[model samples]
Target: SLAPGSSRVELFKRKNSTVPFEESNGTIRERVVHSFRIPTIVNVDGVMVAIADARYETSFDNSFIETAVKYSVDDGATWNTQIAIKNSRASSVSRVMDATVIVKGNKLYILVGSFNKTRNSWTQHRDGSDWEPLLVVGEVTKSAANGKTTATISWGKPVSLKPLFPAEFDGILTKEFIGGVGAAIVASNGNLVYPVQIADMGGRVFTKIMYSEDDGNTWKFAEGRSKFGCSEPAVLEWEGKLIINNRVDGNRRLVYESSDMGKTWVEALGTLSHVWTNSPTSNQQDCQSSFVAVTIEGKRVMLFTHPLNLKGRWMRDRLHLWMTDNQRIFDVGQISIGDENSGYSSVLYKDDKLYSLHEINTNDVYSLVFVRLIGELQLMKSVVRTWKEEDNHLASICTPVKGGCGAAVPTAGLVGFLSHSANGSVWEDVYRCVDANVANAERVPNGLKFNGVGGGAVWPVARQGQTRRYQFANYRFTLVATVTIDELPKGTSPLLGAGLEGPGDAKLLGLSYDKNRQWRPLYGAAPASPTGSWELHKKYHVVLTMADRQGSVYVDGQPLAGSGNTVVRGATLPDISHFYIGGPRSKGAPTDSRVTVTNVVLYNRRLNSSEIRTLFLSQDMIGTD
Candidate 1:
């Protein structure tokens, strides 16, 4: 049992900058200053540890340090005077953020520094001079505590050690961006592996591996040759092999491996789960602050803090954990870790117990929260499956049917849709169902009457050009109706009547579009390739075959032509909104002239060209003899 005051003593007041000033002839000049409120604190084996940064008003001046300590072990009821560890130089100097305290045996070490203050001055140039260089590593020990019996106070000198990724060594002179370091691991071989990130480096963000072999005395940097364009790396060693995991901007979590103790890394690969960001841009706030934990039973678990959806502003502070024995596969689940917006978490297991360290911000102060891992963890099976194209049956042509106006129609041994026009103009409508049935209807009796727009309406099940949208977990097939008419009548085109309803305020992909007044893909670009003949009923059979990182499309058993090799980088499962056989209804066109669809087949994996040819030949869509 600990005393009440013991817990309070661990908390300390943080020092903040008052005002910025420029001294001319020893005179005081005051300016506006930026302030820092919260600090990260840790206690390792009776040694008090803390790391924090302060903001200054003036461009050149540096911020003060925030410190706390507990020397009296009588359950920490009383604390000693706090010390400011930062250098208070009036000129340019770097400050530390998110410092970490680690203990191995009797040695105590601290790792800090995420930005370069000297370079900052050169870049900002508000102060008119260059800043002093700062070191990243700082140290303190139990011997510094001295004997309580003696009247004299004894403390050890703080030393400056090289940064894990020094700017001078690599010519990398940028501040560690947001969501830089999440967690670190010290392997049994005395090697310290720290995963760091530089956001938006030359229009692209990248994650790198920084290591210290001489026990934080020296460091080395390695750019992930295979796995690039990711941030907030978390590392864990299971069964003598090191595994690195990171967050992708719009895809699932990526994983890489190093068998030779962080020497060389393999190419980046996708995990078996799905993840998405809140925005289309790959900037700050687009990624989840993610971390990982390892249990005594050699199970690796991960936690990601992000919003529920990509377009929503509300943050979902839920923690997702993944468990796995083999690095290739994972089982995932969710755990509650408080309500506040959490970021950059660290987890450690010692003495048969699991502990989590995370950053939490209140209205006034920013602090680190320590929580105990609880509950029986659950694991979700992987949803993605790899396949070949020969398994699907291809049908040459079929007619559309009725479940709802935008419902998917069943065709010759398959499911599909058609193209239509309303108001004598071109339109697009996607249906949500695979086969025309009452249950697959988008609207129900007495239920919410779906207007043509601004509600969660099903979109067309189609892909751009001749590509079939490949799904990871379940099979998804789509049909496309590109508008080629250059001009329309005074009223809405009749093509609009036959199309499916719109997506109704729902978010879409980078290059997709919707039909309101006109049908378009998401990125507002013209179709990937459009045929000039809009009035002619020209139909093409398309299929998308998908494997882990490889995907391809086929038209009538022949390979569809495209630019780059279409590889699915991460574990993103495809989604279908609706089947729009004709056009969209938002354009206020007549419902007549709906295009007909025929057989459709969905498969779990990528199909080879020969397999695709056989399927097309069987349905008489393509011929061999």
Candidate 2:
């Protein structure tokens, strides 16, 4: 066995974990088995039990399936012989799919969606009309021998959960409620909860929670169900409440929090939303992830694992780990790197050690492997420590700066407050909230001045391996800058701007000055600004606000008459890399478009017209030259 904190160690290899299937057509017969999917893990009596669906024919859900379990008493160094929690060959159940496990006291609960045969799949046949939710209870037995404790589970009869769920759900024909493929938790109140998906006759799936208040005797459904097209949820007891993270229709996970057991749910925002939806900086496309809330360094934090591929959807290559403190989020790096086999996974924290059981497809065959997450956990704790320090700094400085030469800049949601002066080669953020800085820009009173052909200040909104500060706004933000156009170019000249990720930064949001002495607001492409008529040396309060997929620009305190805003539908919060000052970074500063920029601030939320008007009234002292 390797030392502690070692890398991913293979526990269950191929061929030994998969099940075999047989098919006969008249005289000719064919036999084949593909991949194992939907892994779940639980700690029972100091033993780690990893379970998955043993697909006998293909990786598809319609294939013959059985529940497979591998337990380890020595912390996954060596696993016991493979045991079928619900062996289809021996029992009357022909298929056992989407197995998830829960532990209450010494009892192990194995929950799966059971069917009669291949054609009775949940997704294919009548949208789960023939599928049934099965609950199998197991008595965990532990014994001590040779100074070591060995553990095993004795299986019992399979009980159908359909009797607990009403046949008529929401006054519609309830087709079936299928088992989820992740860890189920016993809430802090001692209620056993499992995340499940129910499909109606129309084939729309929704995630809901089923909890058993009296151990495994009786169960009831959570009144709140997720929106249509969301399923395969992962549940966690966080801060005495239940948070369900579900695989949704799009690239992000939909989250819901329950304060009163599982009866009601509200959509959660802030940390989880930013980490799983906004941040990650790329595609994670509607994949099931493992969620567990654990304590790190005496502080409560949640850990998550999922495929974080940037290239395309279902490119399950870079399975990354993430952690959040319910307020801030950070990446704990990748667990399985460049392994296309990295698909569905489950994670658990036991005895101060973290473990992950994930699928790996080797040569078209699948194997569920155990990875020791000590290294990842260590990195996560360090990042969490850094986040604590960063949050403290932001709390101290993220306030409105009052009466600074002109009007007060609101610091409630201000993330960037770039004013005047330079610290060595670094352009200083007056509040020092974020590390985003520009280098070597000529300093002016409460601002900076730009000259020369390519001399406009370039502020780095985001850099390599860092998330943009504006992402916390989730597509709603305000950008205010004071600018004096010393000279306007013959053509449209960029004053300040930022763009999304694309070839030429397609979703651009900013403003520019034209030869007609009028401002041109830019949203993705461009829209003619009909707001203020500009004078050559006038200091105008240039502002841009984005919310509800619309980008609007304002001069002084009012928007352009009719064409003030541009609607860029389907565009998410742009990952702004560089906020270009004088012109586009690719084109540099436009000739003869010399300008002075001051009090350039970026807020993480929209500022209403009243607040804008207040700032404009105070700063218009430096009007026309």
Candidate 3:
């Protein structure tokens, strides 16, 4: 091994990838094998992005994998879980491997290898193959990103390239095939070229360029001499021309050069010209490899990575990043990324540094971006959870609840329950208790301020079955109150207890303060204790769920922990008519309480543990231990 370069390292995270449903060996981990898998990393318009595909199982066969696209805004700093590029819609068991990330201008494109179910064994792509040439393109454009993590990134549905390809190559009689998990490159002249394989009935796999000029709006297939015998072809730029490297399956990689931007290919040859490897000779080493071009000090540098050990195409042992001033001896050159089952890397060049995202093991995909001036590489990315908006089971309505939000007079849902103390915004006054009692607390701008003694309440604007569904409803419901409590309430203060006997005759049943005025410790709200020491007016985002003779409270986002001290689970609720915010409907109370509530999302149904966690992570301003 070559001597170590003066390099250093920062590990981002050692955790497994997150793909929406991140539970243990359950349906999620089973359908989307994100527990541990392959990841592709690249830099898009300066944003460091990583894409990984979860599998159906740990095995890399036909039950191999399904792909997802995840990205980072910082330079390998933190990645925002997974956003699937290729989904398992056709069959939950469908396999879409090797997400090749390609970027042009501000647009990002993912080319997925759509494997034919007929093909078995992940390790075999015969001389003649069963694949299609649609490029299986999945397109996404990212904008509106600022700072650490983003709450806004517009994404479109993934569509095929058939709409962009010319009629001739659209696969009527062309019978072309394209299924290889590899990277596509942008030409020096701004053309987008994806490396793909063309297969004939005899299983003869030929490599070609799926070229697009009108900014990925349209495409055409160009003829090249190097057509067949190349399974995993990767493209790059050299001295203003286009170059491609291919996997010969258990053999030294093949070389093909295209000066006319892949319109044609002429082979390149030399001693170490094709590839530089110390593996045993004769079809003993071949796998998907990375090839990228970078300009340094006004000169050309061809950077590549692949396995160096040999064991008949399965020696992912000595993965290295090799560099060559010229492409001739690209096979073996100065050692760069010569560390730690590697290769199949996705590379990005920024400010003269080479960033690599590659596979390290079955359960982890790591990154080591090398900056020559410093000669250092490390994983410094932060971990984030993935959230899927649609899951077929949970239906939600997130009301911003800030003043102007309740403008449109309610038809069914809810009205501004909390005393809309403010005069402006719709959320503040429009639905602010219609001639309702306002004693416990008065409205203040966007919220209600209470004084620890009395309580005020708001009811449904309309009495339709929809609005009254929660009244006497058997299904579970969750109430999230964005409240700020000032110190503890009176020994008999009620938060979400029975409402007063009013026009609607609404008798809400919620957890009431115990004789000591102490709330359920399950929520663990006490500033210092399990009971009343909880900090006051400090913005306690609380969630209380009531369902089938069971109810629980969660503070910030954590669920009740200890088995013995869990929330009030056995307790149930009462049913009347309207809903109430503060103390029930009685006016004999609260001219004495200090509280402010700006938002409340009352779900008609309960949320699972996973969904609850997402709400925790998505908070705009609060997070707790």
Candidate 4:
């Protein structure tokens, strides 16, 4: 470890490898197999990322874990939650191991060995079925509000695709196999090329390239194979040629070259002299594994697993950096990346510095570490940028009553409604009324103001009663609305209700005017159903003219059972006064009574299905303006 308080080199030990042990009983005995499962951590652009395979004592609990590659913008004083990177199922035992994470463009891909068991058993290794170490790629984006990151996984079922091979090799192929390793690259033309190890009929370790032009959709295999043995290979495009450095599973570092876009390859001259620091040995003890490659500061840098000595000592699993200017030869050295237990190292360059990430595990506990590259020698640095302030905008609107004290306007278009009262108090007293009345409105810290006094409260804008509304040429339909008890007047049996009344006839649709509104459809009415005492919120959308008869109502995006109808009154202009919100405007009303209106919008024409879906489902439009 580096000396204490030394700025030049800071070493922190995470975990050390354990010696193999044995377990035995009177009737049975078994050898305990243990291997260091190091996570591969890398950052594509500014995105910090890492992935690991978490093994458990029982097959029922095995999980593939992933941690944030970047430090928490909130604070690095604490760590965040580790996410499971596999699909969850109750009955099946689908185990994921040896995961590799790679980011190209806006997408992140994770490749792992997947094992699916046909039956539950304590001792089942090669039994059950095994799939080609699967590759899962996803896109990530930053939140528009909080700037937090989110990732969406891609790649469905792996389909059979032909490999790109020279016409000379006429061997009939049985199956095309593709499995991801620790390294990958994104080409300049936005192509995601993954250096996957492909196996043919003889289980031979050969290299094949798989690339996606349009993100991960429609992937085409690079035509050809390499003669060299490449496992957990890392590929990067530098100086117009593709440089590949593989995990020398046998002995010496194996380097391969490809000039024409991974289609064909040749063991170029001087390839062995570049990375072959140690000669080939039969023991296969002194080779790098779980390695990654990247370009930093106009030079090619490769980060490999802990370098192995000829004496069979795994030197602290350190990450060695190899720099090359001409892509033919690389200068090898060690970058002090925290500790020696650092295996599966992935390096990324941002802002003229390198960021190194590696796995840390001891016994059952496993985790990932984040280190930033700083200073002249490229060391990991930690810095946090705080946000300034929170700025938000909110508004409300309700359907307007006709002649009675109507809302400020037919729509809460711009200049929103004002607080009826500025006392800064709750509506406990205003909630109690002899008859249906709305008054004592006030603006508070939480949201808008006002309370329904008597039987009903006039929402200046009628549409505000529903959670979401769709506007049509003549009629507007409500989609979803939550009428909680707090939002309703106390002592009122029929708490909240909404519908359409034409002249003397009133036809109600759905309602939630009840005390027990959580379960059991409290107060609801369907179209053509008899009017009831309880009023349910009614949403009417889909306006049609003589030429078009396309009209419908939707609940939670699903079309209502029997909501299709003919044009009402043949495009008759709706009376702005007849559009009553809250309670109907009574002619002999003495006091100004209205329902509290919040979050309302008006559209000039009827919306289509897609438009309605976008407005309702989009999280950005829901809580705030």
Candidate 5:
């Protein structure tokens, strides 16, 4: 157990500014284009090597950048050599958000991934932009004639990560983005994994591991974490299970665990389950961090680095790696490497010494440092890591921002609205069964309740004068309700539903049961996909999303989403004609079952997972009455 008062040994260190203040001797010298960010270091054989994101005014917000490597012969007492990595055609390069390194036997490799154009915003990815996942290999060379040693590296044509119709999935448009500070993981099976955040057709960003099991011969996408605001990951392994820590737009890290490599996942629990910020101070809030997992002696431990302040400039400083044997309780109890302004950092354990590479500036990374952790330990543990899309691409099409709904946009595809207190009635061309509307429903102090008898409303979507509004090959619909299920009907009936209904599997999904008698959404029914069985009498904030051919369900802020896809498959989903809420007139046996409907809000477009989470926790769900 690591306790307080455990101090660190300073073996060796160095800090330097790459920005030269020296005047030019002739025509010109390239001035500093922008801040230097993303520091990467690797223990190549017995030599220490490091690299960083060197930016130039090449792309969006100067995100377009290159990498340069520095080497040290005697464990960082000094950096004896340096090298620059540039693209063959300089015109094709810009912002470099994430870069990774791996040692394959005797050679060293590097992979850089991104949106190609800029991080200034997104939607460009949705519009079919150029995406490339780069590969740079460094070959070792040694000549005994003069006893000289150096490394020669070459570029592998910056593998076109775009134009990518990876024989995986349905052959849809493919692209992957990277988050910096955290790099690729070299698997124990001799495979190399680049942690990538993928953007799908529905405008959702999630973390997916792109791996090369045959050492770069072929790369495929595997297991991923929850989507939307859960993205840009830092990964490590213990036993056969892979621990993927996701970066979010809020206060905590969503730790996902995959036992079968990257094939499936679940949010982690207990102590090491997540790491939270004290209060999310300026410049550091919503930022990225680093993780290093290793075997010390017979114990597995992890070393994590982050920006922390008990109060702020009131005075602070890890120049101490927070050590965790269980990831449960972390704190070796001393400063490893840090300061009031020292921000991002990375650590590489080489030659019995811990080499930490980090930044020193408050805003833009300007100063880079190299510090060595010299200490002996009896045991060790394992490990576990944001930014901005400035252009606002998602605005044009109804999409959420930073895990929350953006301001209202122009357009009206919204169809169904079953209010409990009856604040706003979904009127006009709206069609419903007699007594199916809110006017005839039982109104309680909190909201409304259904005893099976009520008016039902049908929003004649496409071709209803609002025809152009709801017409689309693929349309998204979002519905959120805060209610408690008093019981799950033994029959096929449900309390309420909201989805696209045209020609095919129009019910997309609904809260109901299977022949096996388990509670789950309708689209995929196995009688036992999401455990816990939607316990009766529990107040649940349910969020339902209509995307592609399926409807997802969220109990609380988290997504149990959907399961049982084995039974429901869709080659093509139907265009919606109308949305249903509170058991449309046709078949609602509310008395057959029972539930309280506090509020039923509808959106014209499908809300991303993040937005759903936001809506679930919104003020609409604050009452207990």
Candidate 6:
């Protein structure tokens, strides 16, 4: 195990006003740029290379920019001077951005999106000048002396990639520019593939790959494209298949895999199961992420990095690192935390060491850094070992559930399963997914009984310093429970409620019962008409589901009359911090009447009517009271 310590190297210290530049007249001036963005790092023959775009004048996408490169030989302990791929004068000919590097042997290849527009963003190039793809290759000449290795690059001329696309793309390619970001991959089968985004004539964006078969001599476009509304893809080969973790309109990463080298692609959500952050607002928190796959102990392990903030565009602080082995994922640690303005990162593994290069802001000025995640990797390996041990135990007692023969519950996309099945705590979850807490509630035979005045069980959806329990519930989910109301309250009382994320107290989705035994559904604190009437001392199976931003409710295997697909764009599951059993808090305390709730289950995805019916019937067979 590696000892934990702070081991990070700031790649660059100089910013817009302080950066020095030497002109041809033997005079030095301040080389100014708005900010640095889209960092990419790669390892070439033990030498670490890092690159970022130096945006000039403004930090907008259409601003003038140039790609800068620097290297370190002693594993990020030291670095050399910076070199610009192409010096820019803030003009049309000098526009080059989104640099993606791929190292092959002693050669380093860079792919960037360039255009000839005088003064406009890439989106505006459609009217006059379209985006052009360019390739710049460099030969790395290295020398080692006295245990120190130094390297320099001899850059070649820019090669245009516009001619490589097939005739099918003549009209389909976007007129503005071919968008490119993230690192390009040299596939296991020796194919040079660069993931890029382009828009059609109608201006619909999609992700596709431009590949080369024989080095950089020739190129071709992938036959397949991602679904609409996806771009800025980070791709790598896992187990000989191509995987693309692309950005989408939603908060979750739209993951797709291709087996036939991009000719065909299929969604691979089952592989990377967790949705990063699903906020209620639009794609305000969406940003480019970094993903890389590495081999450890002869097994494959994948690493990912992204801004951990879920709030807004400006709060792009707290860059975090996550690791997974296709089966389980863990937020191992944070590469950079606190209120630092950090965004966009790249992770790479070399020589049994993991390193990350990401943008960091100090005093409102943004730059980049290189960090060695030795300790984080140690924790990752330990967690992976635990996963293996648990898998072995599961295999040893493998038995299919049939008529209550097995104790296993729904595992796929199941984040919480609270029941009275466990002996220690009445609030304990059978699947142990989320922590369950209770107040003024007593343990019953197969469930918990809430006091008539104010009592209920609460399950925290998210907690600090821990992995997110409701992993993908924000995208789509189902909340199910078997509850019996012992007696109705004097006024309308909450039967179930989900507390949302905000400064003020509010419940997003809720169900309440009144003294008249009428059940009303509440969304965004707006109460709808009573869906149905309830009887005393009767067990009822309740299911509330949300999909495609619409909400629905079902009771006792029947859909509620007024509970149609009502659009509720107020908040998502991640915004929910707690789920109340008896009812939401009224005045710093739960307001649940006498009730007993059991067999609670939470699925990360919504279930159809048939599936919900099957799940309702299987509750008896699985011995769920």
Report the C-alpha lDDT of model 3 over 342-428, residue by residue, as the tens digit: 445555567555555555542334332222223322110000000111111112323233444312211122211232344321233
TM-score of each: 0.45, 0.69, 0.50, 0.45, 0.51, 0.67
Instruction: Kindly list the per-residue Cα lDDT of model 4 for residues 58-141, writing each as its tens digit.
Output: 212344222112222222233323333443233235555555555776567766555454343212233213443455655555
Q: What is the C-alpha lDDT profile of model 2 across 1-625, one tens digit per residue?
A: 2124747755545544433233233232222335567888888888888777767656666666677676788887777644454434532336787877788878888888877654544654665545678899878788999998878777788888777788765786677887667878888888889988888777678888888889989988878877787788888888777898887645456678888887888876433543354125544456778888888766688888876544445545567776766544555667785546477788888898887888776555776778888787676666656545543543433223343433333445555556654653465554343433443357778676766665565565434232332344445667788889987778777787665655664545777788888777777666445345899988788787876666777787778553335545564555556666664243523343478888777666678776677656655332111
What are the lDDT figures for the candidates, one per model? 0.36, 0.67, 0.47, 0.38, 0.50, 0.67
Query: Could you give candidate 6's per-residue lDDT for residues 14-37 as a string of tens digits?
Result: 353334344557576667666777
Rank by lDDT, highest first: 6, 2, 5, 3, 4, 1
lDDT of 4: 0.38
246 Cα displacement, candidate 6 (Å) = 2.6
Best by TM-score: 2
lDDT of 3 at 201: 41
Off by over 4 Å in 4: 1-38, 58-79, 82-84, 87-93, 118-129, 144-180, 271-274, 277-282, 285-306, 309-318, 327-342, 360-367, 373-625
Provide the lowest-lDDT 10-residue window in model 4: 382-391
Specify the poorest-scoring 10-residue window by lDDT in model 2.
23-32
**Model 2 residue pairs with clashes:** none
Sum up the clashes in candidate 3. 46
lDDT of 6 at 492: 76
The C-alpha local distance difference test score for the whole of candidate 3 amounts to 0.47
Q: Root-mean-square deviation of each candidate, in angstroms? A: 14.5, 8.0, 27.3, 26.9, 18.7, 7.5
Clashes of each: 66, 0, 46, 41, 31, 2
Q: What is the lDDT of residue 576 in candidate 2?
A: 56
Error of 6 at 563 (Å): 21
